[PDB]
Amino acid sequence: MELKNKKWTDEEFHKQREEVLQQWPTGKEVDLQEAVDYLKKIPAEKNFAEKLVLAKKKGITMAQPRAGVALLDEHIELLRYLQDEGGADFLPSTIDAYTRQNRYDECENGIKESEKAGRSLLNGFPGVNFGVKGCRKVLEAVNLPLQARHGTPDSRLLAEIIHAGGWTSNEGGGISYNVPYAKNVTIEKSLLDWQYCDRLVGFYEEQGVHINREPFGPLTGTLVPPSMSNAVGITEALLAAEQGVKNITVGYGECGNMIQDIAALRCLEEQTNEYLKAYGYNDVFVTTVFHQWMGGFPQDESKAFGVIVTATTIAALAGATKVIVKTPHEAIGIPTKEANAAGIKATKMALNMLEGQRMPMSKELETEMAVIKAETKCILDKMFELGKGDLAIGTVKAFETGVMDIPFGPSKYNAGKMMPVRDNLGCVRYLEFGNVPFTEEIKNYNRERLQERAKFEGRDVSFQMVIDDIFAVGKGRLIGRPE
Amino acid sequence: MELKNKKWTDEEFHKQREEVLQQWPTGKEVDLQEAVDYLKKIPAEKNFAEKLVLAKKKGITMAQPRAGVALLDEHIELLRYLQDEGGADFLPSTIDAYTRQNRYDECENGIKESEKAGRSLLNGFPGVNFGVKGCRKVLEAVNLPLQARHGTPDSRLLAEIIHAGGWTSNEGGGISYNVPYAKNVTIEKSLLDWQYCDRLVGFYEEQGVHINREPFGPLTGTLVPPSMSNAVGITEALLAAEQGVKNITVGYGECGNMIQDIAALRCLEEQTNEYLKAYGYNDVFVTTVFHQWMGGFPQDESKAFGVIVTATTIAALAGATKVIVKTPHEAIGIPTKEANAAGIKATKMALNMLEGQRMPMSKELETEMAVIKAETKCILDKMFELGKGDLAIGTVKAFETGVMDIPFGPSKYNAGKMMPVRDNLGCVRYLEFGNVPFTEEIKNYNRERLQERAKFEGRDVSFQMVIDDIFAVGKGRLIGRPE
Amino acid sequence: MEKKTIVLGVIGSDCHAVGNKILDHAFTNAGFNVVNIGVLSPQELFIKAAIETKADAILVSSLYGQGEIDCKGLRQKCDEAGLEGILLYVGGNIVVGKQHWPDVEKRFKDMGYDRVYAPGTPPEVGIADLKKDLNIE
Amino acid sequence: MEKKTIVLGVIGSDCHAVGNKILDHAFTNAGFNVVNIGVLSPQELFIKAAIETKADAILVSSLYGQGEIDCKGLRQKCDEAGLEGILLYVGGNIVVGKQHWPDVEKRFKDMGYDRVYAPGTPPEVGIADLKKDLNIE
Ligand code: CNC
Ligand code: CNC
Structure with missing residues (x-):
């Protein structure tokens, strides 16, 4: 298929469907007619899209963990415990990493070995191998909405199975479930395959079935500047809306400075809505998710609660619709x-x-919001320019030219030039700009902030400071101050 | 002695000292000349007053637990553990409640029972019974500054022993260590006995020995409106300053609304400094202490961390010099x-x-600060008027007339008429004013805020809401919502 | 249900007062005549109030931790005072520290307490138990 | 220290990359020739690199939890490839969940690993061990 930012026709999508369902024998369990009726019988309390609307209506932040194991009954007992003893508001099913590379052979071996060992040897739930039948058992056993949470460049079959399975949200996007998770998948290919996943939700919405989509905000979890993170989320929201998606949660990973983080989440929501309406998507319900600190944690459990609960306070005060829970x-x-x-x-x-x-x-919040919106607009403007108006093509070219560049991304399609580091108040800033297309004014502000840290610490800003910041929270603090 | 807000003369103070030292045989261990030289040899790292100056200079919040047990070696092991494994910045010694009623006979029995039981049957360290010798053993065994933390209407002998013991801070005041802690002690008598405690620190400072004093901000720990709390602390700071105290930490107990709490601590510090200077005390170094939630906790330890760390976030963002740690x-x-x-x-x-x-x-913060300063000033103005310029006499008369009134105070000298309750955002407000001397404007603001809760909850504001608020945090939330 | 008198207070050198107010309120609303001697109450005050008011039970609250010392001896004093068989309840946070509750409960029943309650006991539990023990449930 | 070659990578379907960058930096700074094959690397790539570069050691990182599966069989493949006696180290977060460390260490030694490292191991520990094992301090 050629990549263009245009809704797939029904015939195009169906042809791709017939190919995708053949990729594992559980594809035969997927019947879109039957699945629509199954999905419409789910109570609103177990529909992720509808519960997000409620949370917004009530001005509530909802909590959601990460969780998954190899075996079906064990996975169910786990989720019921998070529901009942934990008091979760939404349930995940974290998919194992073999599934994420479409290695269902390795999933199957892992299931058998997990059975034999009496414990999970997989780091998640092998949704494709468990099929629609298994996924429905999970949904039927719990009393909260269910969402697939994963990191999969080619998620087409997984999406078919989990949605026919009654899971009413799917996390991911063609950038955010590629660059942090893969080394060898082209941006074009993951954008095409995520257009499928968005288009499937678009089909379901056309039949009156509401299903949420969540672009993965935190990316590599490692000092990602808000404007780069937000550029990715806005882009994925726009690309999803084009395929017919109507309920979108955009996300952000905590950087740790409360005003920067609140600025970041507010800018993300505001510019996502702004861009959607500017491009003619006028019926999209946007929510936000804040992820508690996605970098290294301290090992001490009490210290870990210090990170969990400060993170939560930032989410709460930001007005996040959802917060993703970390553990000791x-x-x-x-x-x-x-x-x-x-x-x-x-x-x-x-x-x-x-x-x-x-x-x-x-004033501080307003100032930081202006900075983030300006930086973000620089990046998105350049993407539209490179794509001659087409954001999908603009995204491919942006990656090729370093205009979009994700810190520490393993993808060989990621330039790896831009380098982040914290300023003296712990705000994440740009240390090396690479080809990120900022104005000198924008670069100047970044350097001015960083110079304050150089003066305070009595050392030049540098990659050693980046290393220090990577270890700092595990060592007990936000900012990697000297020895 | 008659009560006036005037520095005791050297003669007056010495005459009281000779009486006070006879109240238990360890009083014979106190030699003022020897104690000044002992104190002057303590390194700055172990001087509470000096470390507070450092914290202020560095813009650091320091952490301090509560802790104390009956036996000397056990108490030392405990404090070493809090220092070393806990990372404490300051050490307490929480004094047992028998000591607090000057029942040294019951302390002695308690020590004997604890030895025999192999565990503490006292709820603190009996400092008067352990004497200067025991108090010095504690100080010499640790590497941080030491403060007596307690709740003692007549603390004169305790103060003599712990300061000669090298503990370079004493918590308390004639209001805050009476009304929450006693039923039958007159306000005049506790004010007189706390003038002694302040005058002793005044003596030491005149010899160049620096010792901190901390009025006990939280009082009964149960829905105390910021303006009433702050009025008490400003009063105690002023009464201490008149006796020659030069290093003062004023305190505040968390109410739970972040903006209210930051407003409260800022107002407290600003008005403390303003009042000290207005009354000509121009050399007093003022710091602040934020106490994590002093009302009932949830039993679940994970929920307890929720409270501990949200409370700490509020302290941090408020710029508190010190924060008092709660535990799971x-x-x-x-x-x-x-x-x-x-x-x-x-x-x-x-x-x-x-x-x-x-x-x-x-604007929100500015508004709340203006409310708190105006309420506080109203109370202090009336106190000065009742005392015809003398704040000590004014405080006695204010309690007699219910101008100053502390929620749930056991003291029979507390009017018990004012009733607090939370508003719809969880700010503590005045539900019933009693004789708290507010203008109608001030009263109407409180009423308007509370009516929003009635509208939201669909019930009239009432004492039942007060009950619900008393239980709410233990039941998992800040505001006592119905059902 | 029908009318009955309790003595209520907080024992020893303990000043904790909030729970005392809630317990007074709750038992009063349940229909008891609550003779509340308040905080910082020695054993003798519980006994003197119980005599003067002909109380059906004594509810001893102990929150501050020294209950193990403070509570020893009350039953004997009650006996010596002519209050043999009076109902004696104790609750709050009656020992120092988190301890294994069955051990603690046993400990205070051995002191002569009829009923012993753990941290965070709702007033409604004590009210239902007193109604049952007074045969007015 | 004297110059020696290691192969470094992250095994299986594991994409975690930041520790890989830090390990490369640290072992390079210590004077090793680091042949970094990166993330999402199957066993065969570790062995191909070791052969091509005459490596002294292979350092397997496994963070994502599936190390138990992924790491099995490497020692045999190395032998078959003619790398008999090569040093094999494994570290990161090599099993699913918190487990009793002595059991985990024996499990991976029984699989043929020379050294086995727990979560949060500093690069410096590995550097010291490898100098010791290579007789270069
Ligand atoms: C508020 C509070 C609390 N306090 Co003070 C502290 N910090 N405290 C204070 C303040 C009291 C103000 C006042 N005058 O009332 C304040 C700050 C002055 C204070 C002081 C002290 N406190 C002290 C201590 C040790 C304690 N305090 C706690 C009670 C510690 C409490 C810890 C907590 N999270 O519960 C606490 C945070 C909450 C108490 C409360 O009001 N709860 C609300 C109230 C409605 O419930 P309640 O009191 O639990 O009572 C209910 C139930 O227990 C039950 N119930 C109670 N009695 C009975 C009896 C019967 C028969 C029945 C059926 C039911 C009951 O029903 C009640 C009504 O609903 C404590 C459990 C905290 C702790 N974990 O260390 C602890 C007791 C420890 C123990 N038993 O092992 C001090 C020595 C200081 C210190 N080391 O922390 C000091 C002693 C003063 C003294 N002379 O007694
Ligand atoms: C950042 C991060 C982390 N991740 Co991910 C999550 N969430 N994660 C991510 C991101 C990675 C981005 C990227 N491409 O790099 C992100 C969000 C994409 C991700 C994804 C996933 N993650 C996953 C999991 C399970 C885990 N992840 C953690 C590693 C979880 C980590 C938890 C944590 N607090 O540590 C984590 C928060 C921090 C890792 C890091 O970079 N640390 C900094 C780095 C410098 O240190 P390091 O990685 O520990 O490496 C050092 C040491 O281990 C040691 N060392 C390592 N290897 C060796 C080898 C030798 C021989 C020697 C001597 C030393 C070592 O030295 C290294 C350098 O200093 C995990 C421990 C968190 C947890 N407790 O659940 C867990 C592994 C569980 C286990 N072993 O039981 C996912 C399945 C999602 C999930 N369920 O949470 C998914 C899988 C992706 C995949 N295909 O592999």
């Missing part, structure tokens, strides 16, 4: 059900301790 | 050394995750 096991391994419930309980307690509270506007 | 055992019993270290670790992690960050000014 984060530095060590996939949390037990108890550790995860602990993180969810700490989070919800913090949210309820802050009911209705929002950060009021200040 | 708060709802159940005096923490183990491990539960206490856990609370300190979570607190310090949060502080370091927020290094240098402050809440910026907003």
Whole structure:
């Protein structure tokens, strides 16, 4: 298929469907007619799109963990515990990493070995191997909406199965589930395959079935500047809306400075809505998700609660629709059900301790919002220019030319030139600009902020500071101050 | 002695000292000449007053737990653990409640029972019984400054012993260590006995020995409106300054609405400094202490961290000089050394995750500060009027007339007429004014804020809402919503 | 249900007052005549109020941790005072620290307490137990 | 230290990349020739690199949890490729979840790994161990 930012026709999509369903035998379980009726029988309380509308209506932040294991009954018991003992508001099913490379052979071996060992040897739930039947068992066993959370460049078959499975949200996008997760997939290919995933949701919406989509904001989780993160999320929202998506949650990963983070989430929501309406998408319901600190965690569990709950406070005051919960096991391994419930309980307690509270506007907030919107607009403007009006083609070219560049992204299609680092108040800034297309004024502000850190620490800003910042939270603080 | 707000003469003070030292045989261990030289040999790192100046200079919030047990060696091991494993910045010694009623016989029995039980049957360290010798053993065994934390209407002998003991701070005041802690002690008598405690620090400062004093801000810890709390602390700061105290930490107990709490602490510090200078006390170094949530905690330890770390975030953004740490055992019993270290670790992690960050000014913050300063001034103005310029006499008369009235205070000298409750955003407001001398404008603002809660909840504002608010945090949330 | 008198207070050198107000309020609303001697109450005050008011029960609250010392001996003093068999309840946070609750409960029943309650006990539990023990449930 | 060659990568379907960059930096700074094959690397790529560059050691990082599956069989493949006795190190977060470390260490040694490292291992520990094992301090 050629890549263009244009809704697939029904015939185009159907032809791709027939190919995709053949990629594993559980594809035969997918019947779109039957799935529409199944989906429409789900109660609103178990529909992710509808519960997001409710959360917005009520001015509530909802909490959602990460969770998944190889075996179906074990996965179900886990989610029920997060629901009942943790008090989760939304449930995930974190998909294993073999599924994410379409290696269902390795998933199957992992299922068998997990059975034999009495414990999960996979780092998630192999949704394609469990099929529509297995995915429905999960949904039927719980009492909250379900969402696939993963990191998959080619998620077409997974999307078919989990949506026919009654899971009413799918996380990802053609940039955010490529560059942080893959080394060898072209941007064009992952954009095309994510157009499929968006178009499937577009089909369902056309039949009256509401299904949420969540571009993955945090990307590599590692010092991602707000304007670059937000440029990705806005782009993925626009590309999804073109295929017919109507309920979108845009996301952001915590950087740690409360005013920068609130600025970032507010800019993200405001510019997502602005861009959607400017491009004629006038019926899209936008929500936000804030991810608690996606960098390295301290090993000490008490210190981990310090990160979890400060993160939550920032989310709450930002007016996030959703917050993704970290646990006291984060530095060590996939949390037990108890550790995860602990993180969810700490989070919800913090949210309820802050009911209705929002950060009021200040000069500082206004200033940082102007900075983020200007930086973001520079990037998006250049993308539209490179694509001669077509944002999908603009995205491919932006990656090729370093205009879009994600810190630490393993993809060989990522330039790897731009380098981030914190300023003296812990705001993430641009240390090396690469080919990111900012004005000198914009670059100047970044350098001015960073020079304050050089003066305070008595060392030049540098890659050693970047290293220091990568380790800082695991070592007990936000900013990687000297020894 | 008659009560007036005037510095005791050297003769007057000495005559009282000779009486006070006879109240238990360890009084014979106090030699003022020897104690000044002992104190002057303590390194600055272990001087509470000097470390507060440092914290202010560095724009750091320092963390301090509560802790104390009956036996000397056990108490030392406990504090070493909080220092070393917890990372405490300051050390307490929480004094047992028998000591607080001058029942040294019951302390002695308690020590004997604790030895025999192999565990503390006292809820603190019996400093008067352990004497100057025991108090010095504690100081010599630790590497941080030490402060007596307690709740004692007649603290004269305790103060003599802990200061000669090298503890370079004493918490308390004649209001804050009476009304929340006693039933039958007159306000005049506790004011007189706290003039002694302040005058002793005045003596030491005249010899060049620096000792901090901390009025106890939170009072009963139960829905105390900021303006009433602050009026008490400003009064206690002024009464201390008149006796020659030069290093003062004024305190505030978290109410839970971040903007209210930051407004409260800023107002407290600004008006403390304003009042000190207006009354000609021009050499007093003022710092602040924010106490994490002093009302009931949830039993669930993960939820407890929710409260601990949200509270710390508020302290950090407020610019508090010091924050007092709660633990995951708060709802159940005096923490183990491990539960206490856990609370300190979570607190310090949060502080370091927020290094240098402050809440910026907003219209909301400005508005709340203006409300709190006006309410506070109203109370202080009336106190000065009742005392015909003398604030000590004014304080006695203010309690007699209900001008000053502390919610839930057990003291029979507290009117018990004013009733607090939260508004719809969780700010503590005045529900019933009693004789608190506010103008109608001030009263109507409180009423308007509360009517918003009635509208939202669909019930009239009432004492039932007060009850609900008393239980809310233990039940998982800040505001006592119905059902 | 029908009318009955309790003595209520907080024992020893304990000044905690909020729960005392809630308990007074709750037992009063349940129909009891609450003789509230308040905080910082020694054993003798509980006994003197119980005599003067002919109380059906004594509800001892202990929050500050020294309950194990403060509560020892009350039953004997009640006996010596002519209040043999009076109902004696104790609750709050009655020992120092988190402890294994069955051990603690046993400990205070051995002191002569009829009923012993853990941290965070709702007033409604004590009210239902007192109604049952007074045969007015 | 004397100059020696290592192969470094992240195995299986694992995309975690930041620690790989830090390890490369640190072992390079220590004087090793680091042959970094990067993320999402199957066993065969580790062995091909080791052959082409005459590596002294292969450092397998596994962060995403599926190391138990992914790491099995490498020692045998190395032998078959003629890399008998080559040093094989494994570290990161090599099993699913918090586990008893002595059990995990024996499991991977029994699989043929020479050294096995727990979560949060500093690069410096590995550097010291490898100098010791290579007799270069
Ligand atoms: C950033 C991050 C992290 N990740 Co991811 C998550 N979420 N993650 C990500 C992002 C990575 C971006 C990228 N491409 O790099 C992101 C969001 C994409 C991601 C994704 C995933 N992650 C996943 C998981 C499970 C994990 N991830 C963690 C590693 C979870 C980490 C949790 C944590 N707090 O540590 C984490 C937060 C921090 C990792 C990091 O960069 N640290 C900084 C780095 C410098 O240190 P390091 O990586 O630990 O490496 C050092 C040491 O381990 C050591 N070392 C490492 N290898 C060796 C080898 C040797 C021989 C030696 C001597 C030393 C070492 O030295 C290194 C350098 O200093 C994890 C521990 C979190 C957890 N507790 O659940 C967990 C592994 C679980 C386990 N082993 O039981 C996912 C399945 C999603 C999920 N369920 O959470 C998914 C899988 C992707 C895939 N295909 O692999
Ligand atoms: C508010 C509070 C609290 N306090 Co003070 C502290 N910090 N405290 C204070 C303040 C009291 C103000 C006042 N005058 O009322 C304040 C700050 C002055 C204070 C002071 C002290 N406190 C002290 C201590 C140790 C304690 N305090 C707590 C009670 C610590 C509490 C910890 C907590 N999270 O619960 C606390 C935070 C909340 C208490 C409260 O009001 N709850 C609300 C109230 C409605 O419920 P409640 O009191 O629990 O009572 C209910 C139930 O227990 C039950 N119930 C109670 N009694 C009975 C009896 C019967 C028969 C029945 C059926 C039911 C009951 O029903 C009640 C009504 O609903 C404590 C559990 C905190 C802790 N974990 O260390 C602890 C007791 C430890 C133990 N038992 O092991 C001090 C020594 C200081 C310190 N080391 O922390 C000091 C002692 C003063 C003294 N002389 O007694």
